[PDB]
């Protein structure tokens, strides 16, 4: 079953600041009272993160390129957002990954779904029409003013799809809160398939349909080094982006969060070759 | 400690301390981590 | 400027950091030596005109 | 080939100025300037 | 030859720099001393070995140069400490020490 | 190779094609089509140093590009290199953070003097 | 998976990670996802037992000079 | 910063030891930095090559560390000789040497 939604109001997507969000645990190693430098796919500090709204008539469900990794932020109340769709062509030609959380249980499927152009869920007060070749199923625990901040990081490295998650109690009305929250790794998924494009799933409210108040943010990961701080209890409390500004570069180089007064050698500047010239007789 | 008005308490060993160190020496050992 | 050479060089660890640190120590040591030898007075004295 | 020469912190004129100050102190004041006020 | 000590230090530093730059021209048992020639002439399985030979030779040269630089730095530091002692005792006072 | 090509004042003999310096690196080359000599200066490379006070006092920083002129990158040209982010003052104070070539830096914004 | 012994220098094999060390009880409260533990020098000094959800410290086996 | 001179010595020694232990984690061009992984994953004809690479890298690291320790030991010995001279001439007697 598919339904076209024709009551949207045209508006450009917004943009805002990432602040110090998007941090996750790079590995499964406990560390105590130490500073560790990692070169992973991370989200830059104070980056331009795309902002989408669900308000009533705005119903933002575009399909975005996956790139090398995805940071999803959700300022959510009443659990409108239920899951995600990953794939390359989003049809039966290729194989797609489906993540859903309905009212009872969390379902992860890898099938060749014939997806709707506008897939959604519905609550009264339709995602795919077919699934032919299903290669993997996984049933897990429930993952789920705006009251809840849900932060997720999706990576697809070496055929392993890593889902990192964090839940934060928040009381900010509109934008992202400013603070630090490390994302614990939640699901390590053995899919081994190509993913280049994704789309999130929302839930309608029927009384036509009404969209509940929700807001989400999409950011993209780039390969970079972070300096992570581990406290006495092994919880990540602070991080430094080594490529953001020279002060954080100095912090990354000296492996300390406090830099004493002085001059410190931090990098090497080389003028890159702008063109290539060949001269022959 | 009759030294003609000269005071050496900050450099002489302290009997009260178990390490038998001077206050200056104790400060030096405290300030090195 | 070879990327492949740098990638192979990374396998050997922090040798480059050690060498740079040693050279930096020598470079600051020379300035410290010059300060110790010549900067022993904090007043710039001048001779009388006559 | 990646070699750089860092300039000295004290330039030649400043080192000459330091020597001039030492010469002026030792000529006009003897050894008094080295142990206290000139 | 009045100013031989300074000229010796300058010559030693310049000679060390010249030797360190000159060591790049040595192949250290590889087919060539030029990285571009190896990268453009051979496949990566054997080019990795040739680059590895160049890296170990150049790293050995650089470590050797740093080692003599540190030894010379120690000698210059000792000479500077002696010079500071002469400045303190001979210029800023009258010294009773013979010679 | 990689370098910057500049007009040369050398007097290459006809057989001679590329010129080498004391260290046997190619410092001059002749163009094979138009017989003119060009110096090959190595491309600008330098150290990047961050001048900062304590993080307890301030988070402001300045950057020094060692041995790099200011036109190939609060801009101040020093003999040590190009200094970005520190204002130059004409007053003279004692050295707080050493920059080089008689230039020192301090915090009062970060000033260089 | 053989029985686990403590306070002795044994050859440990935890989930394919092998070594030789004394396995003692640990006071480190690990997070549920974390399995290994490292010190400042990037050496594994703590581990979580797969059979029983407990944390063990690996002290290295006794060594020293003989004079 | 009153006691900076002792702190620099302590920091340099700790940093050298830390770097020496960190050098064990480098494979030096081998497949892995762990000997046990090489012994369990490969046959002895290739294992000898891999341990040869690890041995030469670790031996070079240890030789570098020992050389740095020897140079620092020489500097500390010079400082200690100076300290003994100050103990003899400033504490056990009155010195006419300026500064
Ligand atoms: C909702 O709208 C989309 C977009 O128009 C429909 O998708 C089209 O479906 C037809 C099926 O015959 C295809 O031929 C078109 O190529 C599709 N368009 C795109 C852009 O993919 C979708 O079918 C509509 N939903 C329903 C239930 O009709
Ligand atoms: C020598 O100096 C010490 C410390 O400077 C003096 O001890 C102080 O004595 C006064 C009163 O007698 C106390 O209020 C202080 O608390 C003491 N200070 C300490 C650190 O103990 C001492 O009195 C001086 N004179 C002699 C003769 O020892
Ligand atoms: C974010 O990007 C949009 C366009 O994509 C741009 O208009 C906006 O200024 C950017 N924000 C920042 C902080 O750079
Ligand atoms: C993944 O899909 C994209 C487009 O769908 C394609 O360009 C890319 O080559 C694919 N990669 C692999 C490894 O199949
Ligand atoms: C949620 O989905 C699962 C699998 O799709 C299904 O078995 C379950 O009944 C669903 N829950 C409800 C309330 O329909
Ligand atoms: C995938 O599904 C189609 C149609 O159901 C079928 O023809 C094809 O053989 C399936 N492929 C595999 C690998 O099962
Ligand atoms: C670490 O945990 C203890 C309780 O086990 C707690 O008292 C302490 O505040 C925690 N430290 C931090 C930095 O949260």
Residue numbers in the entry:
A (entry chain A): 14 to 69, 77 to 145, 158 to 176, 185 to 247, 257 to 330
B (entry chain A): 795 to 827
C (entry chain B): 745 to 794
D (entry chain B): 856 to 893
E (entry chain B), H (entry chain A): 943 to 1041
F (entry chain A): 548 to 620, 641 to 675, 691 to 695
G (entry chain C): 530 to 596
The authors write:
The Delta and Kappa variants of SARS-CoV-2 co-emerged in India in late 2020, with the Delta variant underlying the resurgence of COVID-19, even in countries with high vaccination rates. Herein, we report cryo-electron microscopy (cryo-EM) structures of Delta and Kappa variant S protein trimers – both in the unbound state and in complex with the ACE2 receptor – to gain insight into how their mutations underlie changes in ACE2 binding and antibody neutralisation escape. Within the receptor-binding domain (RBD) of the S protein, both the Kappa and Delta variants share an identical substitutional mutation (L452R) with the previously emerged variants of interest B.1.427/429 (Epsilon). Finally, the P681R mutation (present in all B.1.617 lineages) immediately precedes the furin cleavage consensus sequence (682-RRSR/SVA-688), with initial reports suggesting that the P681R mutation enhances cleavage, and consequently S protein post-fusion transition.
Biolayer interferometry (BLI) analysis of trimeric variant S proteins revealed limited (no change) and moderate (~2-fold) enhancements in ACE2 affinity for the Kappa and Delta variants respectively. To investigate a structural rationale for the observed changes - or lack thereof - in ACE2 binding affinity, we solved the cryo-EM structures of the Kappa and Delta variant spike trimers in complex with ACE2. Compared to wild-type and Kappa lineages, Delta variant spike proteins show modest increase in ACE2 affinity, likely due to enhanced electrostatic complementarity at the RBD-ACE2 interface, which we characterize by cryo-EM. Therefore, the combination of enhanced electrostatic complementarity afforded by the L452R and T478K Delta variant substitutions likely accounts for the moderate increase in ACE2 affinity. Analysis of the electrostatic surface potential of the ACE2-bound Delta variant S protein is consistent with enhancements in electrostatic complementarity afforded by both the L452R and T478K mutations. However, this moderate (~2-fold) increase in ACE2 binding does not rationalize the dominance of the Delta variant over other variants with higher fold-changes in ACE2 affinities (Alpha, Beta, Gamma).
